[PDB]
Ligand binder design. Structure first.
Ligand SMILES: [Mg+2]
Ligand SMILES: [Mg+2]
Ligand SMILES: [Mg+2]
Ligand SMILES: [Mg+2]
Ligand SMILES: [Mg+2]
Ligand SMILES: [Mg+2]
Ligand SMILES: [Mg+2]
Ligand SMILES: [Mg+2]
Ligand SMILES: [Mg+2]
Lengths: 64, 32, 228, 87, 117, 273, 96
RNA sequence: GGGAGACUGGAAUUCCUGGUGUAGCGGUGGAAUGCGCAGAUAUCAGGAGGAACACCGGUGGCGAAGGCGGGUCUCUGGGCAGUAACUGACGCUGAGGAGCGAAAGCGUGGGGAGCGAACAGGAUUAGAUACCCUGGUAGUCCACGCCGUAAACGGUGGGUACUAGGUGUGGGUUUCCUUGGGAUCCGUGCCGUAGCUAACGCAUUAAGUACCCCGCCUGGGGAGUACGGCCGCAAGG
């Protein structure tokens, strides 16, 4: 980890709000959203994550 | 810049507003 | 967030104190109880400030600031030399020079003077000049190297400053908080705690703890560098 | 914005010749269509207060294009005016 | 009276006093203590010794009812939490886990501006 | 609302209902029924309800409030007319069966739209539905005070009731007066809010307008004589000489229904302010 | 038309055997008005992260439809009025 | 997080209901009003209403300026690059005029949880109509219009040509490796050439080199006040 990015660098990925497994590695332990530097992601994919995790929390797919 | 010149105009406007508040009634009913 | 626990800190011996005749009345908050006449520092107040400083450096990295290193000891010259070149941060090893942060119009001249010499070294001019001119440069190197060790590559006027051993380097931390720039440092039971903007509980006479502290303070910049 | 097919057919209709865009008459027709399409949305969202600025900018651009067309030639100007029903 | 083998102690600590209340896993409180109830008044209610003595009194009242296993939950910031936990575990009770439960208002209600002193 | 210009003293700042959403101007002669004013006099002939006098005669315009029958039979609106007896417009429905009826014409009810009563009807303003099928937290109006007893709640203009979480054989309704009341779930309700909400702000301007509606003047008891009103006349402008009291000696108190009535359904009385 | 995705969280008291027919009864309107492809994925007995209308578990369903805004809005309204379903969410699979 | 419209959800404050539960709860540099003993505070469950959307979230994005932070959908403004096929001077400014114009205030229609002008009390002071605490009507909020004043500060008018660089960031394009780096074009920070600048300072985003246009300044008070007029329900400009 800590590379350029997993989405902006690998060139293949998809940010899906239903991907609770993938969003668990990005949400904090308590349930909050981790910072952008710790994840090392471009601004676009960071906002995509943010909105996906927000949709998950809204549909009750995460502990908020 | 300095605050002296600003507070001077502030006090001037405050005194003007106080006079206007005091004289409001002298034109309130004379206006209506 | 969090990067370490108290288990790894207990092994470093960061709960020791000094004699009871060299303390200050305003350092009785971190103490819990007197046992055999030695002072102890709480542990719950360590991880909080550690994470606070970590996030502050994480933010200042993106803002355009980094952390520095300062010191005046002449026994741990190796601990502050190996980890420095890894990230490329400033540091002082032998001689704590005067006027490096508060004065910026003077160090830039010596930086260019040293750059000129390091660039001309590639030519190898030894015969064109007299023996005295070459012999002087040998002692000049020993005179100029014991004061500046990492101030050559900063060139960025960072927005975060870290100080260590405030008891002896009070002038450093004293001038750090001058311009209001965020200041961080570790405090002792015989110094002033209000001088640092973000204190970090930690002993000043523990190399095992100082190494880990410097490592975790320098890794914050690499965290943002590898991402940028 | 305007759909690609709608813009293409509008240009083919009000174009001086095949493969013609950005001409005076074409630009005037595009602006008129844009205003006619935006008036319906404004009639609902009258409290926008932001799209009105773009509306005014487009109207000013159309007026400037019409002024230029009139300065160049009057016959073309009057023909476009009577064909689009403006003023 | 009643028996409660496992319970939980909620400690609401603020800048004025600390209230520690033991309760069954259902929610029916059994015993509780407060610095003011211990005897302290005014600013003395904020000292750590007051919270420690209140926690000790609560532990004694719980042992009177026969409670041994007691988890601990704490409210938002406030002095006396760690001292109360220490006193509870020292008075002959199982400390168990420590799950902090603090209300986190995400900009819900506008609080006062600031205390000028 | 249309404001009259200050042409005459009577039209200084007077207003009138815009009368929008009205298509026809005459009622259905097959549904209209006769009715004559009473002037506030009961069978005995004595003036019982004061301030009731000469007003323009009106029609009844029979309105069905039960809607128990014609469950699966759909119906569309035909016209929107005015009704003096009601403080809101009414709607004429052309039922698929053939008969016509009248409804309070809730707000947002345009012309041409189709409505459908019954239990399997869709929740939408204009259709009747039982409380059992109406989800909680919705807005209704004119349901009833008793199963099959007739809609008698929230019939005024721009008024409605909020249905809270129902439980068992009782559902909670928050009347427009802020009073929460329980009512069995078997009651038939009507989704949507009453129309003509723009009314109630109509400045009548002159006394003749209010008199046309059969509203006679109201004389204050202060100026009356001690033998007529408790607030004796006296010498000069007198505030009343005692506490406020009704003309029959009833003070301004609770005056509620007899204590311990059949009101076990009320869960929370309204709030004064 | 435009592509759209519809996530649905139903009541745990129901059964997967009646979940799919219930979703088809609602997609009847789409197939009779829009006539679009139908891909309905279902997975039941999934525990939620917190209480949802006095329930700890539920059944999730995902549908994809290339229909009109009015059609998707009508479907969302029908699902919100129905009681057998608890929660609904409409997303636009497009880049925007 | 460009704007308007519709739908939707979590935390948290307050109230109420069904349990548990005591004689204190709140609060200050120290205290007292007040709230409880007529079951306080506090904990479990449920219901109600009004606002805002922690964490992502910042010298990072948009807008001409105000200003724009939860999620879904309809409409829509504006910006950069490549392809340069399209007309070829249509480029820029703008007296009056028109629109937008933070917050507060005003008319009407609703609600009102927290905070809170005024107002009641408590405390200090020789004297406290304030700084501190307890309640709190307008307001803060939604719907239709006025009010046009802010440090509406970058105290920097609008468009273009030119004047060493280093260091960051966001944006979409190609060459060199084969993830790594340079150039190209726009916004946004810092250090610094010449130059400008009374100094502070600006310095490729000029306050420099020069062109086009509008407004304003020619000593401080009087006074941004007086009369008349302009619009406005009023305050007021
Ligand atoms: Mg009498
Ligand atoms: Mg008299
Ligand atoms: Mg002008
Ligand atoms: Mg306002
Ligand atoms: Mg106050
Ligand atoms: Mg001005
Ligand atoms: Mg500078
Ligand atoms: Mg005048
Ligand atoms: Mg004036």
């Amino acid at each position: 980890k800590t590379r350029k990015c997993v989405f902006c660098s690998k060139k293949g990925q998809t940010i899906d709000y239903k991907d609770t497994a993938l969003l668990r590695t990005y949400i904090s332990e308590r349930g909050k959203i981790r910072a952008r530097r710790v994840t090392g992601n471009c601004v676009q994919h960071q906002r995509d994550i943010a909105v996906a995790v927000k949709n998950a929390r809204e549909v009750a797919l995460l502990p908020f | 810049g300095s605050v002296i010149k600003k507070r001077r105009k502030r006090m001037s406007k405050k005194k003007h507003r106080k006079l206007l508040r005091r004289t409001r009634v002298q034109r309130r009913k004379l206006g209506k | 967030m969090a990067v370490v626990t108290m288990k790894q800190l207990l092994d470093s011996g960061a709960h020791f104190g000094h004699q009871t005749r060299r303390w200050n009345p305003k350092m009785k908050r971190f103490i819990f109880t007197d046992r055999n006449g030695i002072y102890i520092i709480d542990l719950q107040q360590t991880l909080t400030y550690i994470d606070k400083a970590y996030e502050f450096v994480k933010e200042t990295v993106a803002h355009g600031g980094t952390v520095l290193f300062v010191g005046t000891k002449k026994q741990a010259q190796e601990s502050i030399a190996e980890e420095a070149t890894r990230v490329g941060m400033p540091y002082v090893n032998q001689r704590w020079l005067g006027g490096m942060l508060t004065n910026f119009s003077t160090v830039h001249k010596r930086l260019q003077r040293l750059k000129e010499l390091e660039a001309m070294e590639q030519t190898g001019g030894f015969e064109g000049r007299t023996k005295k001119e070459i012999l002087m440069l040998t002692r000049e190197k020993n005179k100029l190297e014991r004061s500046l060790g990492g101030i050559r590559d900063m060139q960025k006027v960072p927005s975060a400053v870290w100080v260590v051993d405030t008891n002896k380097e009070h002038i450093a931390v004293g001038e750090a908080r001058k311009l209001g720039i965020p200041v961080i440092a570790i405090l002792d039971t015989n110094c002033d705690p209000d001088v640092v903007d973000y204190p970090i509980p930690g002993n000043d006479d523990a190399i095992r703890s100082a190494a880990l502290l410097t490592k975790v303070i320098a890794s914050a910049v690499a965290e943002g560098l590898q991402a940028r | 914005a305007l759909t690609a097919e709608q813009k293409k057919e509008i240009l083919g209709q009000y174009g001086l010749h095949d493969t013609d865009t950005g001409s005076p008459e074409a630009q005037v027709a595009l602006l008129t269509k844009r205003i006619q399409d935006l008036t319906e949305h404004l009639k609902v969202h009258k409290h926008d207060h932001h799209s009105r600025r773009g509306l005014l900018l487009l109207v000013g651009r159309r007026r400037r294009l019409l002024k230029y067309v009139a300065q160049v030639d009057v016959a073309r100007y009057r023909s476009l005016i009577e064909r689009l029903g403006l003023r | 009276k009643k028996n409660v083998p496992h319970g939980a102690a909620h400690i609401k600590s603020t800048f004025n006093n600390t209230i520690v209340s033991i309760t069954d896993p259902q929610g029916n409180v059994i015993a509780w203590a407060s610095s003011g109830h211990v005897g302290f008044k005014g600013s003395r209610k904020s000292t750590p010794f007051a919270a420690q003595l209140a926690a000790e009194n609560a532990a004694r009242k719980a042992q009177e009812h026969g409670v041994k296993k007691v988890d601990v939950f704490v409210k938002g910031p406030g002095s006396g939490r760690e001292t109360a936990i220490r006193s509870l575990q020292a008075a002959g009770l199982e400390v168990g886990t420590i799950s902090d439960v603090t209300p986190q208002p995400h900009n819900g209600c506008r609080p006062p501006k600031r205390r000028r002193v | 609302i249309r404001k009259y210009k200050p042409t005459t003293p009577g039209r200084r700042g007077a207003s009138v209902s815009d009368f929008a959403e009205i298509t026809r101007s005459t009622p259905e002669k097959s549904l209209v029924r006769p009715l004559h004013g009473k002037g506030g006099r009961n069978a005995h002939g004595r003036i019982t309800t004061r301030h009731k006098g000469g007003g323009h005669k009106r029609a009844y315009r029979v309105i069905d409030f039960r809607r128990h029958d014609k469950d699966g039979v759909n119906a569309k609106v035909a016209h929107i007319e005015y009704d003096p007896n009601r403080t809101a417009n009414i709607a004429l429905l052309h039922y698929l069966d053939g008969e016509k009826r009248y409804i309070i014409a809730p707000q947002g009810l345009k012309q041409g739209d189709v409505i459908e009563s019954g239990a399997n009807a869709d929740i939408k303003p204009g259709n009747n539905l039982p409380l059992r099928n109406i989800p909680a937290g919705t807005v209704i109006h004119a349901v009833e005070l008793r199963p099959g007893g007739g809609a008698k709640l929230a019939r005024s203009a721009g008024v409605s009731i909020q249905l809270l979480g129902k439980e068992g054989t009782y559902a909670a309704l928050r009347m427009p007066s802020g009073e929460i009341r329980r009512v069995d779930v078997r009651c038939r309700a009507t989704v949507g809010e009453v129309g003509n909400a723009e009314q109630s702000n109509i400045n009548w301007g002159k006394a003749g307008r209010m008199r046309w509606k059969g509203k006679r003047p109201t004389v204050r008891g202060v100026v009356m004589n001690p033998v007529d009103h408790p607030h004796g006349g006296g010498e000069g402008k007198t505030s009343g000489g005692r506490h406020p009291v009704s003309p029959w000696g009833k003070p301004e108190g609770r005056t509620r229904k007899p204590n311990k009535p059949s009101d076990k359904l009320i869960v929370r009385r309204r709030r004064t302010g | 038309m435009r592509p759209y995705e519809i996530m649905v969280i139903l009541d745990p008291t129901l059964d997967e055997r009646t979940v799919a027919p219930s979703l088809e009864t609602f997609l009847n309107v789409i197939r009779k008005d829009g006539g679009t492809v139908d891909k309905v994925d279902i997975w039941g007995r999934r525990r939620l992260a917190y209480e949802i209308a006095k329930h700890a578990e539920g059944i999730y369903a995902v549908i994809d439809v290339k229909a009109e805004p009015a059609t998707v809005s009508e479907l969302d309204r029908q699902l919100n009025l129905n009681e057998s379903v608890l929660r609904t969410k409409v997303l636009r699979t497009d880049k925007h």
